[PDB]
Amino acid sequence: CFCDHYAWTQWTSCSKTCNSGTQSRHRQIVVDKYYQENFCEQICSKQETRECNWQRCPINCLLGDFGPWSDCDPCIEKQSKVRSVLRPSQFGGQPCTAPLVAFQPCIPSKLCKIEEADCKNKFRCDSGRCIARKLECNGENDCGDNSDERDCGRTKAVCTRKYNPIPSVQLMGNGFHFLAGEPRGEVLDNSFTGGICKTVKSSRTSNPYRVPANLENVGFEVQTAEDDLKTDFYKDLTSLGHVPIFYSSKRSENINHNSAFKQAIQASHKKDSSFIRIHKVMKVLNFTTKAKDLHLSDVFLKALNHLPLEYNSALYSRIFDDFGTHYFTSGSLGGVYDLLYQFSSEELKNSGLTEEEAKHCVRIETKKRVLFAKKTKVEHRCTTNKLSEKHEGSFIQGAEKSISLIRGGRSEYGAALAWEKGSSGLEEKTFSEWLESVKENPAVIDFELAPIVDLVRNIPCAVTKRNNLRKALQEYAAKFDPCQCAPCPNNGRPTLSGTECLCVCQSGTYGENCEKQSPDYKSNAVDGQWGCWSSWSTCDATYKRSRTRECNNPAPQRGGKRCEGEKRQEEDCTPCINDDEEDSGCPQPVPPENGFIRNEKQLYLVGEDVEISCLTGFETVGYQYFRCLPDGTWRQGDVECQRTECIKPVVQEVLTITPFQRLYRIGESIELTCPKGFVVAGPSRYTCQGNSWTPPISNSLTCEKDTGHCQLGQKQSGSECICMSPEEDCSHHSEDLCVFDTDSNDYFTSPACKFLAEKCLNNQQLHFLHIGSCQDGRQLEWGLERTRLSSNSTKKESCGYDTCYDWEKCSASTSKCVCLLPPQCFKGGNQLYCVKMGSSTSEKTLNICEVGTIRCANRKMEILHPGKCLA
Numbered sequence: 001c002f003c004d005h006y007a008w009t010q011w012t013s014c015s016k017t018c019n020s021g022t023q024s025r026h027r028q029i030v031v032d033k034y035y036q037e038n039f040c041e042q043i044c045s046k047q048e049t050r051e052c053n054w055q056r057c058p059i060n061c062l063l064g065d066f067g068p069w070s071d072c073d074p075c076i077e078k079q080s081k082v083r084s085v086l087r088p089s090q091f092g093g094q095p096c097t098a099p100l101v102a103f104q105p106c107i108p109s110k111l112c113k114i115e116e117a118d119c120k121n122k123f124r125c126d127s128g129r130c131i132a133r134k135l136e137c138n139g140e141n142d143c144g145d146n147s148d149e150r151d152c153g154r155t156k157a158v159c160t161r162k163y164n165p166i167p168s169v170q171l172m173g174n175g176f177h178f179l180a181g182e183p184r185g186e187v188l189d190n191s192f193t194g195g196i197c198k199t200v201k202s203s204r205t206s207n208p209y210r211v212p213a214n215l216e217n218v219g220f221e222v223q224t225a226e227d228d229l230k231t232d233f234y235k236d237l238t239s240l241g242h243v244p245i246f247y248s249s250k251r252s253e254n255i256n257h258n259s260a261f262k263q264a265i266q267a268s269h270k271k272d273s274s275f276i277r278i279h280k281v282m283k284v285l286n287f288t289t290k291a292k293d294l295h296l297s298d299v300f301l302k303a304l305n306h307l308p309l310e311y312n313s314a315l316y317s318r319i320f321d322d323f324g325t326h327y328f329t330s331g332s333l334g335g336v337y338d339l340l341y342q343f344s345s346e347e348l349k350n351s352g353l354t355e356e357e358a359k360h361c362v363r364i365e366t367k368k369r370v371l372f373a374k375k376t377k378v379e380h381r382c383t384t385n386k387l388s389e390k391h392e393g394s395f396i397q398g399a400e401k402s403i404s405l406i407r408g409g410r411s412e413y414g415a416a417l418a419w420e421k422g423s424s425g426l427e428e429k430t431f432s433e434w435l436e437s438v439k440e441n442p443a444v445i446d447f448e449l450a451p452i453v454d455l456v457r458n459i460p461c462a463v464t465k466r467n468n469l470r471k472a473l474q475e476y477a478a479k480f481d482p483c484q485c486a487p488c489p490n491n492g493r494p495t496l497s498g499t500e501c502l503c504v505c506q507s508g509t510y511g512e513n514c515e516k517q518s519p520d521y522k523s524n525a526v527d528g529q530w531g532c533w534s535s536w537s538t539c540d541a542t543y544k545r546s547r548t549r550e551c552n553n554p555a556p557q558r559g560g561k562r563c564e565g566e567k568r569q570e571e572d573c574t575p576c577i578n579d580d581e582e583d584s585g586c587p588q589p590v591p592p593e594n595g596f597i598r599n600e601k602q603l604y605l606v607g608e609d610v611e612i613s614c615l616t617g618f619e620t621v622g623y624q625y626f627r628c629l630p631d632g633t634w635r636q637g638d639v640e641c642q643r644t645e646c647i648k649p650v651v652q653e654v655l656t657i658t659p660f661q662r663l664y665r666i667g668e669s670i671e672l673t674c675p676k677g678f679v680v681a682g683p684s685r686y687t688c689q690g691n692s693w694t695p696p697i698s699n700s701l702t703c704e705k706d707t708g709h710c711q712l713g714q715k716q717s718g719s720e721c722i723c724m725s726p727e728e729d730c731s732h733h734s735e736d737l738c739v740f741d742t743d744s745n746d747y748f749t750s751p752a753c754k755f756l757a758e759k760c761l762n763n764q765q766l767h768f769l770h771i772g773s774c775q776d777g778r779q780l781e782w783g784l785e786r787t788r789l790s791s792n793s794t795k796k797e798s799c800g801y802d803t804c805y806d807w808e809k810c811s812a813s814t815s816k817c818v819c820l821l822p823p824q825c826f827k828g829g830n831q832l833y834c835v836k837m838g839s840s841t842s843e844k845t846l847n848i849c850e851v852g853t854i855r856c857a858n859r860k861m862e863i864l865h866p867g868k869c870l871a
């Protein structure tokens with residue numbers, strides 16, 4: 001039978017327009033005579049099916065509704081608001097572009113707020129940083145602003161000599177964002193030096209460099225070897241798979257670089273690709289970040305505080321962006337020559353070289369052309385194979401291009417090392433230029449990390465904002481997980497970059513979604529891959545809570561690897577928590593009896609003094625200060641409060657105190673006495689009052705020599721008194737007198753004894769005046785006015801004076817003259833009419849008696865002239 005007698009219908013339309021439908025067509029069979037007779041039913045196929053439109057349907061970015069508005073209390077009154085990427089762009093879908101989090105102007109719950117409570121016995125840099133007072137006036141900027149050193153009068157040097165800092169030491173203190181493979185903000189302070197002077201010596205470079213406190217180990221010895229120039233081969237990039245965990249870049253050897261990988265994945269699509277990598281680290285330093293008590297950076301520490309206590313996904317994640325994900329525990333500093341070469345697997349297979357051979361040809365070619373390798377034998381296996389043959393014997397130039405994974409130096413210079421047709425990169429000149437840059441701009445290389453979380457350990461609520469942080473981090477990485485991705489054409493393994501999913505191709509496949517396969521590639525299996533996690537479960541009676549993934553997404557198929565890991569995961573679950581805990585002076589001392597301390601407190605500083613004083617009627621005897629001992633104990637003098645006591649008065653060896661005591665009690669008297677010829681000038685009895693006497697003449701007291709009817713004017717001889725000679729008879733100077741001389745208009749001092757004696761004859765020429773030595777006084781003037789009365793006056797008195805003025809009267813052995821009232825003018829009074837009274841302010845008539853009685857008593861008037869007055 002001829003089957004095409006019954007012709008095909010048209011293919012139907014494809015059941016789908018993408019993601020691979022089917023279509024069919026069938027013979028147009030009529031059961032006619034010819035049909036039944038030619039066994040057409042037994043021998044003809046009657047239908048055809050085939051797949052169609054197997055191109056992937058493009059998937060467009062899908063964001064979600066926004067979250068609840070976010071309160072604001074920065075000095076920037078803006079409101080943060082977030083939505084997230086539900087579905088990531090794929091296979092040429094529309095990428096997402098309306099930014100994830102949008103902020104606006106805000107209404108403040110509280111006006112601009114700043115904090116002030118931080119430093120107790122610590123010192124406050126005016127920057128606000130709080131450092132150990134120990135670190136003050138020590139010849140070193142420990143504050144930053146050097147405030148801790150401003151006007152220091154003298155300083156305790158930490159370091160004997162000025163040592164210089166490791167240059168670029170800060171780079172080992174900056175944060176590391178794992179996912180993005182780039183260093184972020186300064187996170188450790190690595191200039192901080194604690195006052196402690198640790199140092200370390202460069203090989204063959206003069207003076208030691210100054211190690212900072214955070215570096216437990218620094219190294220300057222640099223090894224050179226072949227081992228250092230390493231090459232790997234990659235049949236495809238799916239190999240790179242090795243939650244971010246603390247690792248080493250010696251172990252992983254799988255680098256993410258913001259563009260690096262993506263370029264290479266994009267390259268891998270252009271055609272069936274294999275990759276040869278070749279790198280060589282170029283060190284200037286080892287270094288080991290000391291494990292605990294790291295000195296954070298200002299800016300980091302500040303920001304790491306303005307973080308709320310209650311969990312807050314939005315603002316926590318922000319630290320990762322700003323500061324990173326890890327921080328360097330150990331590493332080196334310099335640069336890394338690192339190039340991923342891209343080779344077309346058809347070329348390689350046509351070259352017939354094995355991986356080991358090809359890796360080698362790139363090794364020795366790099367060595368000759370880029371590194372300045374002294375000289376070497378040519379190797380025809382690398383030079384005359386079918387690939388190198390088409391490029392003047394270069395194997396490297398058989399590549400499509402190189403991608404640069406170089407770290408170190410300025411990017412301009414790294415980029416040049418990456419060859420492509422007609423470009424630079426296989427010229428020594430080029431390599432040396434980069435190499436310069438790498439000294440001028442090192443980078444941390446060959447380095448292990450640690451989660452940035454283990455750094456936030458000594459703030460107010462460390463343990464709080466620590467677990468607050470692991471949460472904000474888990475959810476951070478959640479956001480970058482490839483599970484969100486639709487699966488890929490041939491066991492391609494999806495990887496999320498930003499908000500789109502690039503397909504990483506298995507060797508033997510290319511095309512923009514790894515759809516095209518080369519004639520070698522055969523498989524048709526499908527390895528399993530986790531769908532996304534599930535949502536957390538309600539917290540249980542037990543801490544127990546739950547989460548769940550399903551090995552769907554690409555469901556495992558046709559003998560393809562079931563996805564490996566867990567379908568479920570259990571963590572436990574049921575405030576402001578501090579971090580765990582890792583001189584003091586003395587109490588008020590006890591006075592000695594009858595005293596008290598001059599300063600009451602509950603607590604004294606070690607080394608403080610307090611003074612002991614005494615109640616009234618007592619005085620301290622002994623050192624009067626107690627000192628606070630480090631002990632918490634008081635150092636005490638033998639001090640006490642003794643009762644007041646007078647001591648022994650001013651001893652002139654002449655006098656004799658009695659009772660003789662060395663100390664007298666308040667209330668007891670002494671009797672000062674002198675020998676027979678002598679008598680005490682002052683009183684004979686002083687008494688002890690409050691530790692002084694009544695009162696101690698301090699030498700103004702010694703025993704001077706102090707112990708008949710003739711009346712002492714004349715001396716006896718023949719039972720009859722006769723006038724004594726003044727220059728021959730007068731011995732013991734009588735009291736010194738002040739006598740006046742009418743004949744000489746002159747006064748002078750004289751001994752009474754002589755005066756007396758002289759009186760016998762000339763006395764009507766010399767008049768007494770004042771007791772004591774001559775000296776200006778009212779008496780003088782008075783004795784003047786007296787003597788002026790002059791002639792006409794007669795005197796019959798003998799007090800011992802013994803002369804008495806007319807108006808006065810001797811007191812009869814009482815020893816001095818007295819005044820009179822005008823009433824008693826018995827004896828005749830010469831007529832001194834003219835006199836001014838003063839009271840009546842007039843001139844009236846008055847006798848010498850009345851005139852005399854007024855000048856003696858009050859001396860309160862002026863005598864105009866003897867003889868009649870105006871009145």
Ligand SMILES: *[C@@H]1O[C@H](CO)[C@@H](O[C@@H]2O[C@H](CO)[C@@H](O)[C@H](O)[C@H]2NC(C)=O)[C@H](O)[C@H]1NC(C)=O
Binds near residue numbers: 218219221222330
């Ligand atoms: C850090 O660098 C130091 C050198 O500064 C390295 O110490 C050397 O280690 C090698 C072998 O590991 C020894 O042969 C040398 O004797 C060591 N030199 C000194 C001066 O110690 C050290 O290995 C490096 N550490 C890391 C992490 O690689």
Ligand SMILES: *[C@@H]1O[C@@H](C)[C@@H](O)[C@@H](O[C@@H]2O[C@H](CO)[C@@H](O)[C@H](O)[C@H]2O)[C@@H]1O
Binds near residue numbers: 016017018019057
């Ligand atoms: C047919 O034409 C294609 C180019 C796309 O426009 C298709 O849209 C997609 O259709 C598939 C059908 O399997 C849906 O699953 C996709 O979500 C839809 O975007 C169209 O059907």
Ligand SMILES: *[C@H]1O[C@H](CO)[C@@H](O)[C@H](O)[C@@H]1O
Binds near residue numbers: 004006007008
């Ligand atoms: C269906 O198959 C083809 C159509 O492409 C025809 O050649 C054949 O004869 C039958 O009709």
Ligand SMILES: *[C@H]1O[C@H](CO)[C@@H](O)[C@H](O)[C@@H]1O
Binds near residue numbers: 009025
């Ligand atoms: C089925 O449809 C195909 C195109 O999809 C044609 O090539 C064929 O001739 C038949 O009509």
Ligand SMILES: *[C@H]1O[C@H](CO)[C@@H](O)[C@H](O)[C@@H]1O
Binds near residue numbers: 528562563564
């Ligand atoms: C889920 O994740 C694991 C690795 O953690 C894969 O092996 C699996 O295929 C899917 O990606």
Ligand SMILES: *[C@H]1O[C@H](CO)[C@@H](O)[C@H](O)[C@@H]1O
Binds near residue numbers: 243481533534
């Ligand atoms: C499974 O999915 C969840 C959400 O993406 C993550 O928490 C986890 O890291 C894993 O990707």
Ligand SMILES: *[C@H]1O[C@@H](C)[C@@H](O)[C@@H](O)[C@@H]1O
Binds near residue numbers: 357
């Ligand atoms: C080169 O040959 C290919 C086929 C593989 O066996 C590689 O491992 C080898 O290096």
